[PDB]
Design a binder for this molecule. Structure first.
Ligand SMILES: *[B-](O)(O)CNC(=O)c1ccccc1F
Ligand SMILES: *[B-](O)(O)CNC(=O)c1ccccc1F
Ligand SMILES: [Cl-]
Ligand SMILES: [Cl-]
Ligand SMILES: [Cl-]
Ligand SMILES: [Cl-]
Ligand SMILES: [Cl-]
Ligand SMILES: [Cl-]
Ligand SMILES: [Cl-]
Ligand SMILES: [Cl-]
Ligand SMILES: [Cl-]
Ligand SMILES: [Cl-]
Ligand SMILES: [Cl-]
Ligand SMILES: [Cl-]
Ligand SMILES: [Cl-]
Ligand SMILES: [Cl-]
Ligand SMILES: [Cl-]
Ligand SMILES: [Cl-]
Ligand SMILES: [Cl-]
Ligand SMILES: [Cl-]
Ligand SMILES: [Cl-]
Ligand SMILES: [Cl-]
Ligand SMILES: [Cl-]
Ligand SMILES: [Cl-]
Ligand SMILES: [Cl-]
Ligand SMILES: [Cl-]
Ligand SMILES: [Cl-]
Ligand SMILES: [Cl-]
Ligand SMILES: [Cl-]
Ligand SMILES: [Cl-]
Ligand SMILES: [Cl-]
Ligand code: NA
Ligand code: NA
Lengths: 470, 470
């Protein structure tokens, strides 16, 4: 008899009808597949043969059923059981009058990529689809910190108080870029853009990446994302991307871990009965963002939750467990265009918890499913995890890395005071200031007419008119 | 006294208040600018200095006003005067109850790029903007033969009877790709896609280009197009592109000239009074599409006009001048998303005539402005040109190049008959056939499940079900 164990060696099952069983069994079979093919001296070319593959996949499965293998998972028993009890008891809080609402969650150790526990859905016995590991959906606006703002900062094209355009603009096809139901507003800081999750600032950020020839794909593929096509205007908002919850948690793990990626995993080791090691996880840490970038983003994502603009989570949690709400939470929400998918990604320095909700057939949720329902549900979920394992979230604070550069900039331009040109009149650019955080060598530039990320000529004439106004 | 002359040496003016004057004067000043900078030994670096530039631009202008230069244009006097009389007399036919409708046209010699005449607008005295040379607008669906279908054919990814998906699909942001007001239909041939100008087949064609790593930019830049960003889902429909009528005529010149680009020009030579040559046009022909590709596209674009689906032009012309309607006309229309810009591009083997209409402030035209108004106007315009210069359009036929490969293919799959897989059942793929034209070495491939350009799994299950049906 083979067994699957929790991280401490306690047996989960021998080779039983829930997500934990089938998820950890499936991964184990994949590792056994690669092991057996190699053992049998089957090449990459022979492995391409579909008949050969089907044989080796069946071999790997039977090999487990009849062998004496010991499969060590990363799963924490108390934590995972608590997460199942949370979804059983509180999952109904997801139901928003758009029918039954499905859900996936993955809890990940930021320093190892180990998956400590997860939620595959509302109830395996009623619907088996695995929403933590198997289903793939647009990650929506939780794309923005990774693909737009974080890369711009890392490249030194943007600092923490940089200004962006949120003025009306169209896609190349002539359609207005919409956010919720607004065609846009005016200039705004990166923090307001993030807190509100506006679309236009992210569009312009990604265009600025394209114009500077930035290798955005290299960033993403270092985190294990697969995106078929980078030439998409809405990439940074979630367009043209589709991810599992497990994979997306790993992107947020990378930001939370001061920029260092560890590859997600649920199997840590497989041994034969005699102790032969058939598989073992090999850590391959990668510095994906500079420590400066990651720690600047942490600061911004702290205020995404504190501001409470797109999620009630911090209020929900404060009431359930005020001492846990005082841990150093950061996070980002996402909402797709017709309210089909909602995300909330949460981190403390120690753990990252990813969350998605939506419908299996992709029909819309209610306008508030992510702001309120998923926020309140994930608050219960985080409380349940904490109660089951009181120290697991930790009391450490995220903190700016010493390598961060701090510049004094104009609140209005996000750039250092100095002379600028406003047709004719060369002007002394005065007024109240603020510290902006950068991830380059020299920090913020001198103020310059086109001070913002994006903007049309109209936009800048208006902006500078308002500015000059004082 | 300096003068500007027609192509035969007849004086246009000395250095008078219409488009012809200011257009040919402006180009001449640019050529004089480059000449004078070089004469004076001003480097590229010194030329970057904005003060230096302004001086040399003023120098070039005065140099003309006070010198004895002879500026030879490509303009044909009879033809250009006729085009002015046509727009004066018939321009009102553009007015569609969306206010005054502006217009630009450029008539180009396919074998030289010489611009024989043009229409800058409804009336210079009332509105000076030059709509033939200066204003830039999306070319809309006239992008498709150049950037999508023509390049796919040239690369041997597509033949004249290849099948494409027009099933509903969304942009990456989740919005349905719309055409007119339909979310789409089913499979269709390239000819039906072109005749109707559907959007979805062009989207998939361009995606297929991206997936094969095709250097689409190299094609376009060989025709002198400047497109800032190729990573745009709607590129092939006109999104993210903005062109003058003069530049866009030159793309259609390239297709009409069996694939060989000649650079558009309106100045052919400038001489000092003593005969010194200050500037002279240097032909630089480039084979942009293979002769096979260009001649296959000619065949398709013939039927875009003959079918009369998106333009009444051939009917309009048949009535005005039935002997000229029997010349070998090919062409493509374009309409932007809110009916803001309409195009019609027309060629015979000898000439290409580009046409745009729209409003100076970009507000919408009526639903039919391009189908009917601009078609009827351009019919009068072509008749006027012919009457002024009876042989200029020519009686030559476009013809398939001997290098074209012809394959017998299934009407339903656009591919050669053969066995295919339709879950389980391997099937003999029978039924009525047709000759498809290719620009590769081997012609059409054997039929294969994913037979069309684009399509979702749903799409193919449906298609193959219908097919199997017979
Ligand atoms: B964000 O608050 O989820 C806003 N994002 C979107 O509008 C967006 C646009 C395009 C594709 C996906 C998506 F979530
Ligand atoms: B064609 O018949 O003009 C259809 N083209 C369009 O819908 C289109 C899409 C996007 C941008 C421009 C444009 F003309
Ligand atoms: Cl489970
Ligand atoms: Cl499962
Ligand atoms: Cl064996
Ligand atoms: Cl455990
Ligand atoms: Cl990239
Ligand atoms: Cl992915
Ligand atoms: Cl790209
Ligand atoms: Cl794993
Ligand atoms: Cl053993
Ligand atoms: Cl670093
Ligand atoms: Cl708070
Ligand atoms: Cl709240
Ligand atoms: Cl400073
Ligand atoms: Cl300020
Ligand atoms: Cl004129
Ligand atoms: Cl002019
Ligand atoms: Cl001089
Ligand atoms: Cl002449
Ligand atoms: Cl859209
Ligand atoms: Cl390209
Ligand atoms: Cl151009
Ligand atoms: Cl590109
Ligand atoms: Cl010229
Ligand atoms: Cl002289
Ligand atoms: Cl050729
Ligand atoms: Cl006809
Ligand atoms: Cl008709
Ligand atoms: Cl054949
Ligand atoms: Cl057929
Ligand atoms: Na959101
Ligand atoms: Na059209």
């Amino acid at each position: 008899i083979s067994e699957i164990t929790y991280s401490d060696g306690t047996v989960i099952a021998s080779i039983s009808r829930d997500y934990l069983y089938f998820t950890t069994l499936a991964e184990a079979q994949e590792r056994m597949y690669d092991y057996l093919a190699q053992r049998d001296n089957v090449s990459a070319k022979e492995l391409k043969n579909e008949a050969t593959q089907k044989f080796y996949r069946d071999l790997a499965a039977k090999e487990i059923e009849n062998g004496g293998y010991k499969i060590t998972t990363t799963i924490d028993q108390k934590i995972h059981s608590a997460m199942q009890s949370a979804v059983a008891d509180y999952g109904y809080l997801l139901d928003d009058g758009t029918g039954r609402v499905e859900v996936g969650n993955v809890l990940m150790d930021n320093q190892t990529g180990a998956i400590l526990g997860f939620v595959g859905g509302r109830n395996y016995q009623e619907n088996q689809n695995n929403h933590a590991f198997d289903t793939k959906r647009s990650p929506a606006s939780t794309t923005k910190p990774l693909l737009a703002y974080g890369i711009a900062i890392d490249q030194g094209l943007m600092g923490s108080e940089t200004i962006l355009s949120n003025y009306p603009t169209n896609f190349a096809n002539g359609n207005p870029i919409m956010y919720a139901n607004s065609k846009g507003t005016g200039m705004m800081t990166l923090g307001e853009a993030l807190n509100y999750s506006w679309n236009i600032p992210a569009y312009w950020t990604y265009r600025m990446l394209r114009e500077n020839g930035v290798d955005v794909k290299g960033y993403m593929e270092k985190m294990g994302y697969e995106i078929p096509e980078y030439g998409i205007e809405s990439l940074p908002m979630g367009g043209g991307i589709e991810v599992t919850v497990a994979q997306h948690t790993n992107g947020y793990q990378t930001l939370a871990n001061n920029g260092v990626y560890h590859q997600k995993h649920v199997i840590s080791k497989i041994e034969a009965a005699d102790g032969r090691v058939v598989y073992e996880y090999q850590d391959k840490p990668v510095q994906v963002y500079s420590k400066a970038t990651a720690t600047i983003m942490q600061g911004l994502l702290r205020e995404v939750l504190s501001s409470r603009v797109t999620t009630t989570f911090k209020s929900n949690l404060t009431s359930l467990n005020p001492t846990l709400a005082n841990a150093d939470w950061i996070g980002k929400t996402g909402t797709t265009g017709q309210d089909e998918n909602m995300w909330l990604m949460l981190s403390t320095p120690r753990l990252t918890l990813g969350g998605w909700i939506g419908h299996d057939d992709n029909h819309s949720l209610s306008q508030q499913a992510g702001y309120s329902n998923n926020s309140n549900y994930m608050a219960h979920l985080v409380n349940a995890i904490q109660q089951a394992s009181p120290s697991i979230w930790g009391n450490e604070r995220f903190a700016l890395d010493p390598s961060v550069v701090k510049s004094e900039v104009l609140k209005s331009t996000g750039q250092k005071p100095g002379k600028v040109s406003v047709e004719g009149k060369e002007v002394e650019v005065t007024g109240s200031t603020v510290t902006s955080y950068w991830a380059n060598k020299s920090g913020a530039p001198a103020t310059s007419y086109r001070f913002a990320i994006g903007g049309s000529d109209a936009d800048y004439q208006n902006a500078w008119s308002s500015i000059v106004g004082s």
